TrEMBL record, chain A:
Its EC number is 1.3.1.9. This is Enoyl-[acyl-carrier-protein] reductase [NADH]. One of its GO terms (molecular function) is enoyl-[acyl-carrier-protein] reductase (NADH) activity. The gene is inhA. GO terms for biological process: fatty acid biosynthetic process; response to antibiotic. Keywords: Antibiotic resistance, Fatty acid biosynthesis, Fatty acid metabolism, Lipid biosynthesis, Lipid metabolism, NAD, Oxidoreductase.
UniProtKB/TrEMBL annotation, chain B:
GO terms for molecular function: enoyl-[acyl-carrier-protein] reductase (NADH) activity. InterPro entries: Enoyl-ACP_Rdtase_NADH, Mycobact_enoyl-ACP_red, NAD(P)-bd_dom_sf, SDR_fam. Pfam families: adh_short_C2. Pathway: Lipid metabolism; mycolic acid biosynthesis. Keywords: Antibiotic resistance, Fatty acid biosynthesis, Fatty acid metabolism, Lipid biosynthesis, Lipid metabolism, NAD, Oxidoreductase. Homodimer. Homotetramer. Its EC number is 1.3.1.9. This is Enoyl-[acyl-carrier-protein] reductase [NADH]. The gene is inhA. Belongs to the short-chain dehydrogenases/reductases (SDR) family. FabI subfamily. Transmembrane segments: none annotated. NAD(+) binds at residues 13, 19-20, 63-64, 94, 164, 193-195. It comes from Mycobacterium tuberculosis.
Amino acid sequence: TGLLDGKRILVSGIITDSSIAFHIARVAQEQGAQLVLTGFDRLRLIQRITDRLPAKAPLLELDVQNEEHLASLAGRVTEAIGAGNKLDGVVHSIGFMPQTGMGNPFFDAPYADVSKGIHISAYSYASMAKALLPIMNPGGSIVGMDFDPSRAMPAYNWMTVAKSALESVNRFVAREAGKYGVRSNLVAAGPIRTLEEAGAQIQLLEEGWDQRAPIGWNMKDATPVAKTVCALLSDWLPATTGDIIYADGGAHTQLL
Amino acid sequence: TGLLDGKRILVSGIITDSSIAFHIARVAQEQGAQLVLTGFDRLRLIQRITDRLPAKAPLLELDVQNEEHLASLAGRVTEAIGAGNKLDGVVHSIGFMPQTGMGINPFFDAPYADVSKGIHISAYSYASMAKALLPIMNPGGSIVGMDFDPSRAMPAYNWMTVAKSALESVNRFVAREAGKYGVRSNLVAAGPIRTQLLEEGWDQRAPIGWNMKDATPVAKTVCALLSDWLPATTGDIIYADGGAHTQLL
Amino acid sequence: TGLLDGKRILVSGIITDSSIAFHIARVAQEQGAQLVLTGFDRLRLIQRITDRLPAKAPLLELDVQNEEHLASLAGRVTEAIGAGNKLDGVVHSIGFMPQTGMGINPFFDAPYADVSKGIHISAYSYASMAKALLPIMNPGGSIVGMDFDPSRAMPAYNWMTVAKSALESVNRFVAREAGKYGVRSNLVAAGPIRTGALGEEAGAQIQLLEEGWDQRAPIGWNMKDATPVAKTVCALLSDWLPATTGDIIYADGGAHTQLL
Amino acid sequence: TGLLDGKRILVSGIITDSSIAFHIARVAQEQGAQLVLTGFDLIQRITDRLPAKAPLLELDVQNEEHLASLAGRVTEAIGAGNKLDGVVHSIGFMPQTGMGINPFFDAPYADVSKGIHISAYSYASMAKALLPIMNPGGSIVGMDFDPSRAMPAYNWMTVAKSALESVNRFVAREAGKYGVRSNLVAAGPIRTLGALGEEAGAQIQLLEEGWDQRAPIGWNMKDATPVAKTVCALLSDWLPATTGDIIYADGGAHTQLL
Ligand SMILES: NC(=O)c1ccc[n+]([C@@H]2O[C@H](COP(=O)([O-])OP(=O)(O)OC[C@H]3O[C@@H](n4cnc5c(N)ncnc54)[C@H](O)[C@@H]3O)[C@@H](O)[C@H]2O)c1
Ligand SMILES: NC(=O)c1ccc[n+]([C@@H]2O[C@H](COP(=O)([O-])OP(=O)(O)OC[C@H]3O[C@@H](n4cnc5c(N)ncnc54)[C@H](O)[C@@H]3O)[C@@H](O)[C@H]2O)c1
Ligand SMILES: NC(=O)c1ccc[n+]([C@@H]2O[C@H](COP(=O)([O-])OP(=O)(O)OC[C@H]3O[C@@H](n4cnc5c(N)ncnc54)[C@H](O)[C@@H]3O)[C@@H](O)[C@H]2O)c1
Ligand SMILES: NC(=O)c1ccc[n+]([C@@H]2O[C@H](COP(=O)([O-])OP(=O)(O)OC[C@H]3O[C@@H](n4cnc5c(N)ncnc54)[C@H](O)[C@@H]3O)[C@@H](O)[C@H]2O)c1
Ligand SMILES: CC(=O)/N=c1/[nH]c2ccccc2s1
Ligand SMILES: CC(=O)/N=c1/[nH]c2ccccc2s1
Ligand SMILES: CC(=O)/N=c1/[nH]c2ccccc2s1
Ligand SMILES: CC(=O)/N=c1/[nH]c2ccccc2s1
C-alpha cells in the first residue's frame, strides 16, 4: 500500500547509484510504482547500476539531443508497458553543461558549449513532454530537477543560466500538459554529492546551505529529494502546476 | 494504509462545513490522522459542524487574540491527546479582516485599529500558535498555514492581502524556530474557494483549471505537507491554485 | 541646474544627521528641490539637525500615529509652500520597532502590542501619508518609501522584517490609489546603513550579516554612506523613472542578486 | 546641462526609427551623451535621423571576429585615451517558429538556440568585449520583458528573456571588478514596426489592453520615451548602488493582478 501503487512512471537520468534519479527510482518502486527507465550513452554500465534497484525495470535508450530517439520514444515506452497502457508520471533528471560553462571564466565559454548545455538541461524538458504527453493518463505528473537560479553564484555559471531557462520552459510545458489533465513541476534541490577556485567557492556555497537551512541539509542524502519528487508524482498535490517545489532544507528562505 | 496514519494533528479554523479547515480535517481523518480541533467564539455551533466529520475529535476553544487561551493551549491539547503524546502536525486556517479593510471600502478608509486586529488574527497568530504548540510537537512534525498569493495587488482584498504578505514573512521566521524542534513550517497558497471577475480569471489562467466550489485539492495539498513526503521543505509556500500564479494570461 | 529643479518635496524621517532622510533631503536640495520637512516628537533637536542641511526648510510636526496630525497635514503643508502650490514629491523615511520585536529578543517573545505599534509606524503610515498628501500632489509626482529586502528571514531584524513585508504590500496598493492622481509610488530597498551594545553573540551575527553584504555586492557596499541610497530616492523623485510604480528599486550594491 | 553630459555611450540595436534603441539614442544625445552606434543588417540612413552625428560600427553578435575587434574599433571611433561610460544592449531575435502562432512544442532547437544566442548570450559577449574599455562608474543596460510568468505567443522568446535575466546577474559579477554596473530594463509592450490572424491577433490585443488596465499610471504602447528615459536613468550616476538588477518600466503592470 504505497504512495504510487499501480502508477506507471518513466524515470530518466540514472548514470550512477548516486544519481538523484537512482534514488527517485528506488523510492518510487518502494512505493509501488512500475518503472520504465531511460539512459544516455553508457547503456551497459547503466544496466549494471539499475540491477541494484529493488525491482526489475526495462531500460530504454534516450539521448535528448537525438531527434530519432525522441520520435520513437512513445512507441518504445508503450511496447515496454503494454499496448493500451499509458504513463502516470515522467521524471526528467537530466542536466549537462560542458566544463567551459562551469567550474573557467563565465566570459570564456563559447556559445557552442552553452547551447549544448541549454539543449540538454532546459529544452529537453519540452522535448520529453512533447514526446510523452500523448501517452500520459489524466491526473499524470511530469517532474523535472532544478536548482534555484534566482541569484547568481560562483562556479555554476552557465548551468545556472540553463536552470533559469528550464524554469521558464516548465511554465510553458504546464500550459501544454494541462490539455491532457497533466501537471508539470520542478523540484529545486539543494546540493547533492553526485560527482581550484571553483572548488573553494563551491565549498563555501555548500557549507552555507546546511547553516541557512532551518531543518539542516545533508548533501550526502538524496532521499529527501527523492521523496519530494514522489510527492509530486502522487495524487496529493493535484492543484500544483507550472511550479517549483524547493527540497533544499528551507535554505532559500533564509539570508543567514 | 493512510497517508497520515497514526499522526496526531491539530486543526484550527472550522466555522462551517464549507471552511477550508473542515475539508482539511475530513481528508486528514480519511487518511488515518487522529485530530484535535480548535474553534473560536461559537463553540457549540462549531461542535455541531464537527459532528459532520467521519471520526469523533475533541474540540478546544482558541481565540488567537486571547493570551490566556494561548497560555493554556498545550496543556489542554495534552489532556485531549493523552499525557506523554505529542502532536505531529498543526494546521492554521485562521484569518479575519474587518469589513473596513476588505470589499467595497476604499483602501484608505480602513482605520488602523481594524487593520491591526486583522493582522493580529491573520498573521501574528501563526507565530503565537507555533510558540504555544512547538513544545508539544514531535521531530518530523509539520506546521501548515493557509495563504493566498499577495505578491501583487488586486481589487477588494486590500488589507487582507497586506496581512498575507505579513503572514508569509512570519512563516519564514517560524521556520527558524520550528527547525530547532525538527519541525517544518509552510504555507499553502490557495486559489479562491467559495466558503467575481478576479475569481473567474483564475480558471482561465490555471493550466489544469480551477474549481472554486471544490476545497478538496487544497485539503489534499495541506495533507501532503503534514505527511512525511515533503521532508526537506520549510519556510516555504506551496501553491494549490491550479497553476494560475505561473501564467499571465 | 539640478535633477529636481523647481520641485516641491516633503521629506519625513529626519531625527539625526545620520538619518537616511537627512541625506535624502541634502541631495534633493543640492539638486534644486524646495523642501518641506516633517519631524516627530523632538522638534527642537530636529531643528538643530536641519540647520545642517544646505538650505533652510520649514519643519512641520508629524506623528504618524496621531490622526489629528494627519488630518491637518495637507493644510499645514499648503501654508508652508504657498496657496495654489502642490507637492511634486513625498518621501516616507519612517520606521520603528520596539526592542521586543527587533534585536536580541527571541522572535516568539514579542508581544502583539509592540509588533502592532511597529507595523503602524513602519507600514500602515505609508498609506496614511499617501492619503493625507495625494490631494495636494501634482500629476507626474512621486511618493518614495524606504524598505529593506524582507523576502528572506534573517537574524535579529525579526518583526521589523515582517513590517517591511507589510510595507511592500502597502506600496502596491498605494500605487493603485496614487495612479488616479498621475502619481507614482515606489520603495527603495537599501542595504544596511550605520545610522557591543547587543552583546557578543548577537553582535557577531549582525557583523557577519553586514560584512556578507559587501562581499555579495558585485560593486561593494559601504555601510557608512547613505549617499548612494539618497541618490536613488532622488532618481525616483525625478522625471527619469516615469513608468515605474508599485515597485521596489534596490540600492544595495546588487547584494540581493547574488547568493555568495 | 544634461543627465549624461560628456558620457561616451555605445548603443546597439537600431534598425528602424521605431526601435527602442533609436529612442534611447535620441534621449541620450538630448541629455548630452556622445554616442557610438552598432548595427547589423541600410542603417546609416536611420541613424542620420538622430539629433547628432555618431559613428556607426558593424556588429553581428553571432560573429566572433566582430566581437574580437569591437573594442579596438570603438577606441578608434572615440579616440585614443578615451573610454566608454555606458553600453546599451537593445538586441533580440526569435524565429517565427519560436514566437507567434507556432505551437510551443513545434520550435526546433536550432531556431531556439539562434534566438538565445542573439537575445541572451550576446549580453555576456558584449560585456566581455567592452568592459576592458569602460570607465569605473560605467553602466551596461539591456532590454528585457518580464518572463516570470508564461503567456500566449511569446513562447521561446520568454525563455530567452528568462535566460537573459540570469546572464545579467553573472555579467554584474564580472562588471563589478571594473566598477561597472549591469542592469536590465523590463519594458511593457511597445508598438514598434492582423498579420498573425484572427484568433492569435485577439489574444495579443487582450494581452496588450490588459497591460494599460493593470498599470496604475496607464501604459501607452505607442510611446517608447518612458522606456528610453528609464534606460538613461540607469546610464546616469543617479542609481549608483544598483547592479545585477531589473528596473520595470511597464506602468507598474507587473505589480497588479487585476
Ligand atoms: N547534484 C546536485 O547538487 C543537484 C542539485 C539540484 C539539481 N540537480 C539536477 O538534478 C538532475 C540530475 O543531476 P545529478 O546530480 O543526479 O547528476 P547525474 O550526473 O547523476 O545525472 C545527470 C544525468 O543527465 C544525463 N544526461 C546528460 N546528457 C544527456 C543526454 N544528451 N540525454 C539524456 N540524458 C543525458 C546523464 O546521463 C545523467 O544520467 C540535473 O538536472 C541536475 O541539474 C542536481
Ligand atoms: N476562501 C478562500 O478563497 C481562501 C483562499 C486562500 C486562503 N484562504 C485562507 O484560508 C483560511 C481559512 O479561511 P476560509 O476561507 O476557510 O474561511 P472561514 O471563514 O471558514 O475560516 C476562517 C476561520 O478563522 C477563524 N477565526 C477568526 N478569528 C479568530 C480568532 N480570533 N481566533 C481563532 N480563530 C479565528 C474563524 O472562526 C474561522 O473558523 C484563512 O487564512 C483564509 O485567508 C481562503
Ligand atoms: N539604517 C538602515 O540600515 C536601513 C536600511 C534599509 C531601510 N531603512 C529604513 O529607512 C528608514 C529610515 O531609517 P534610518 O535608518 O534613517 O533610521 P532613523 O532612526 O534615522 O529614522 C527613522 C525615523 O522614523 C521616525 N519615526 C519614528 N516613529 C515615528 C512616528 N510615530 N511618527 C513619525 N515619524 C516617526 C523617527 O523619528 C526617525 O526620524 C526606515 O524606514 C528604515 O527601516 C534603514
Ligand atoms: N514590445 C517591445 O517592443 C519590447 C518590450 C520589452 C523589451 N523589448 C526588447 O527591446 C529590445 C529591442 O527590441 P525592439 O522592440 O526595439 O525591436 P527592434 O527589432 O527594433 O530591435 C531588435 C534589434 O536586434 C538587432 N539584432 C538582431 N539580430 C542581431 C545580431 N545577430 N547582431 C546584432 N544585432 C541584432 C536588430 O538589428 C534590431 O536592431 C529587444 O531586446 C526586445 O526583446 C521589446
Ligand atoms: C562536463 C560535465 O560533466 N558537465 C556536467 N554538467 C552537469 C549538469 C548536471 C548534472 C551533471 C552534470 S556533469
Ligand atoms: C468581516 C469579515 O467577515 N471578515 C472576514 N475576513 C476573513 C478572512 C479570512 C477568512 C474569512 C474571513 S471573514
Ligand atoms: C527601539 C528602536 O529604536 N527601534 C527602532 N526601529 C527602527 C526602525 C527603522 C529605523 C529606525 C529604528 S529605531
Ligand atoms: C521578426 C522575427 O522573426 N523575430 C524577431 N524576434 C524579435 C525579438 C525581439 C525584438 C525584435 C524581434 S524580430
